[PDB]
Amino acid sequence: SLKQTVYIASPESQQIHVWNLNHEGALTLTQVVDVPGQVQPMVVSPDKRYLYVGVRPEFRVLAYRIAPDDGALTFAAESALPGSLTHISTDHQGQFVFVGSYNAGNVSVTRLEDGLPVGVVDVVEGLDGCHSANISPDNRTLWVPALKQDRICLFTVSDDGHLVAQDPAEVTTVEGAGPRHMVFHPNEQYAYCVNELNSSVDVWELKDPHGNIECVQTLDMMPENFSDTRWAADIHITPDGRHLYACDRTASLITVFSVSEDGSVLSKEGFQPTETQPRGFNVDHSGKYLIAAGQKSHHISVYEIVGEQGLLHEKGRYAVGQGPMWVVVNAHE
């Protein structure tokens, strides 16, 4: 039967909370990890053997072995990075770990040898405010949002992990939009990017009728009457590709979007008040539950995704560490 583990990063208290998620959406605390640093971004390896996380003030990628039974974590390795690890991810084969650094303004590739990080293979500078690195469905193109430059850079990922700027070298957003995080639709035809500075979501078609990457839709994710400081953060889509969510740190809301059948058109369904100042959240592998953290509430809330509209229904509230801001869910048989 399906078993899932929810991981929460709380940098301020340097902790990682490990929860078991049952079919009713209830969580039970499995473990509290004391990380030797302020842990922020996290990602599970494709083979699910490891959890890679980034820490500061000593910039490093930390690899934790994931117990296949209860998902418990144990330190396995560490590898130094040139700058702050704002975002972290891997390619589909689990051969490389990609790291976007906001402060250093770059993206780097770290070689993974049998799941463990052994150093930086390549780095691309000049990407002011790089906020994430996301490999495409075919595992060949890395989409790298540069928040300060209002663009998403595109690089071909060679076999030995080197990044080669494609042409076009990138796609552009609205002036002052601030592209931050993004995800791809399960059908591999579209990508959705959340823009931090103007709290909007862009729908990107990977290859339109003319063979180009085009932004085919742009929506304001905020309530129509909202007119405060826009501070968008995270974005996620359910496994079935029917529901897409995004959060804003100022309004402390999760915007619910419904997705058209082909995935090209988004529709704003409603908003869910959530944990104070939500920087990170995620959905489970069944597409039935949504877990959101409050950077200023030091708690996470679990919601059930209901019906076609996919609106959220609060089920529980749990205490975590200080300043939680990242959530990931690992599923195992």
Curated annotation (Swiss-Prot):
Transmembrane segments: none annotated. It catalyses: 6-phospho-D-glucono-1,5-lactone + H2O = 6-phospho-D-gluconate + H(+). GO terms for cellular component: cytosol. Its EC number is 3.1.1.31. SUPFAM superfamilies: Nitrous oxide reductase, N-terminal domain. Keywords: Acetylation, Carbohydrate metabolism, Glucose metabolism, Hydrolase. Pfam families: Lactonase (PF10282). It is an enzyme of class 3 (hydrolase). Pathway: Carbohydrate degradation; pentose phosphate pathway; D-ribulose 5-phosphate from D-glucose 6-phosphate (oxidative stage): step 2/3. GO terms for molecular function: 6-phosphogluconolactonase activity. It comes from the Bacteria. The modification N6-acetyllysine is found at residue 288. The keyword Hydrolase applies. GO terms for biological process: glucose metabolic process; pentose-phosphate shunt; pentose-phosphate shunt, oxidative branch. Catalyzes the hydrolysis of 6-phosphogluconolactone to 6-phosphogluconate. Belongs to the cycloisomerase 2 family. This is 6-phosphogluconolactonase. It comes from Escherichia coli (strain K12).
